[PDB]
């Protein structure tokens, strides 16, 4: 992708994760886990709803036509009959050609997007008290429960509580 | 189309060991795992355990901590669940079911195998006996049927007249008699006109006994 | 053709309102006993040996 997250610094997608687009693994002292991100998911979700509403919406052709087949040879008016269509006909495959590469590669583009904004949001909840490990794991330097693991889950988590022990573990 | 497909009926008695089957397709296999919970007949639900087929980590409920190993294979994509030292309460249904390849996860049991049935007995295999219940009327609609009686172990077919005969007719669970065998009766609702015309026969399949019987019904006056 | 060596040709006339129709012949006329009502719309003919269905 553009920002390199999916088939990027993130190694593998997990198709075990089957409620929801992006989430989290942890492992603490209780043991590991999976779990969503609805909030990102649906970001994700709803971009590219709108998207295909957008090329799938009042895209019907309507108006009368000319005869676009012919028994028998003519000359001038049905040569130019079949040349408006023939036109017509490569100029709207040409259309349907670049919308579909322009909006693919957007919608890759924007899911990478989707990942990597929920882990900068991630490290920047984390504050001091984890490091990047690269792969898209952060190491915690600080002892955490699943309950504080949700915490982060769920944005309410209270970088100041663990700040000291998790420096003091980073440090020496 | 994720399919869990599991192994055969099982019938054992107690003491022994048994070890059931779960062959997975239609999905990565060591992207998930898998969970393993038994019905007892007519009653609810009971969790005994999960495994990853990931990390190949390992959660049992206390209760089968000592009898139940669960274990998969790769290979076959196949998870196996094996129980030791059997008593006859642990007579039941073992259901097989995906679960997050992670214990803690979000999600649970979104795909069930077709079950396998375990029977704990110390009664050896027999066949069913068959004896009519005879109708008689005290001009109208009378019932008649078939009991089937002492078999072992479960399941029993019961048609009549080869099939041709469905409408009116109830075929009852099996009771399970305080001798270790089962019993059941089927029945059917008939016009008692067609009682001295017609023939009604009931067909009565007992697979693990290789029993095959046919009986019929008249009043006798 | 159909057993006649004999044809006919045929022409249409529009006429529009406050405008007279006028016809002159001294011989071989095949004369309109009237006239089709015309109507602007979306209707159009095509050639297609589909079955209709309900």
């Known amino acids: 992708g553009l920002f390199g997250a999916i088939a990027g610094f993130i190694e593998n997608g997990w198709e075990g994760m089957i409620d929801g687009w992006y989430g989290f693994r942890h492992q603490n002292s209780e043991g590991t886990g999976q779990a969503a991100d609805l909030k990102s998911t649906q970001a994700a979700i709803d971009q590219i709803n709108g998207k295909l509403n957008r090329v799938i919406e009042k895209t019907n052709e309507k108006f009368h036509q000319i005869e676009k087949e012919f028994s028998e040879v003519e000359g001038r008016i049905q040569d130019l009959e079949k040349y408006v269509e023939d036109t017509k006909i490569d100029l709207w495959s040409y259309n349907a050609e670049l919308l579909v590469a322009l909006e693919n590669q957007h919608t890759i583009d924007l899911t990478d997007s989707e990942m990597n904004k929920l882990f900068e949001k991630t490290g920047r909840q984390l504050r001091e008290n984890a490091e990047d490990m690269g792969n898209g794991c952060f190491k915690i330097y600080h002892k955490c429960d699943n309950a504080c693991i949700e915490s982060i889950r769920n944005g309410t988590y209270d970088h100041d509580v663990y700040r000291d022990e998790a420096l003091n573990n980073r440090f020496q | 189309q994720v399919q869990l497909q599991q192994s055969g009926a099982e019938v054992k008695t107690p003491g022994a060991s048994v070890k059931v089957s779960c062959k997975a397709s239609?999905?990565?296999?060591?992207?998930?795992?898998v969970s393993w919970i038994r019905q007892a007949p007519g009653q609810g639900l009971e969790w005994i355990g999960w495994?990853?087929?990931?990390?190949?980590?390992?959660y049992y409920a206390q209760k089968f901590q000592a009898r139940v190993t669960m274990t998969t294979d790769t290979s076959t994509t196949t998870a196996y669940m094996e129980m030791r030292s059997l008593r006859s309460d642990d007579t039941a249904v073992y259901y097989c079911?995906?679960?997050?390849?992670?214990?803690?996860?979000?999600?649970?049991?979104?795909?069930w195998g077709q079950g396998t049935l375990v029977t704990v007995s110390s009664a050896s295999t027999k066949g069913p006996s068959v004896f009519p219940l005879a109708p008689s009327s005290k001009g109208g609609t009378a019932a008649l049927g078939c009991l089937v009686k002492d078999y072992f172990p479960e399941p029993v077919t019961v048609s009549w007249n080869s099939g041709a005969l469905t409408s009116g007719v109830h075929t009852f669970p099996a009771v399970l008699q305080s001798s270790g065998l089962y019993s059941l009766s089927s029945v059917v609702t008939v016009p008692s006109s067609s009682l001295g015309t017609q023939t009604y026969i009931c067909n009565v399949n007992h697979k693990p006994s290789n029993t095959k019987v046919d009986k019929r019904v008249e009043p006798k006056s | 053709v159909r057993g006649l060596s004999s044809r006919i040709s045929i022409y249409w006339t529009i006429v529009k309102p406050g405008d007279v129709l006028v016809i002159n012949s001294n011989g071989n006329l095949i004369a309109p006993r009237g006239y089709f009502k015309m109507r602007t719309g979306k209707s159009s003919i095509m050639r297609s040996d589909a079955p209709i269905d309900t």
């Open positions: 495994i990853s087929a990931y990390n190949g980590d390992t």
């Open positions: 079911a995906r679960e997050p390849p992670l214990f803690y996860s979000s999600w649970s049991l979104d795909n």
């Open positions: 239609g999905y990565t296999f060591t992207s998930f795992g």
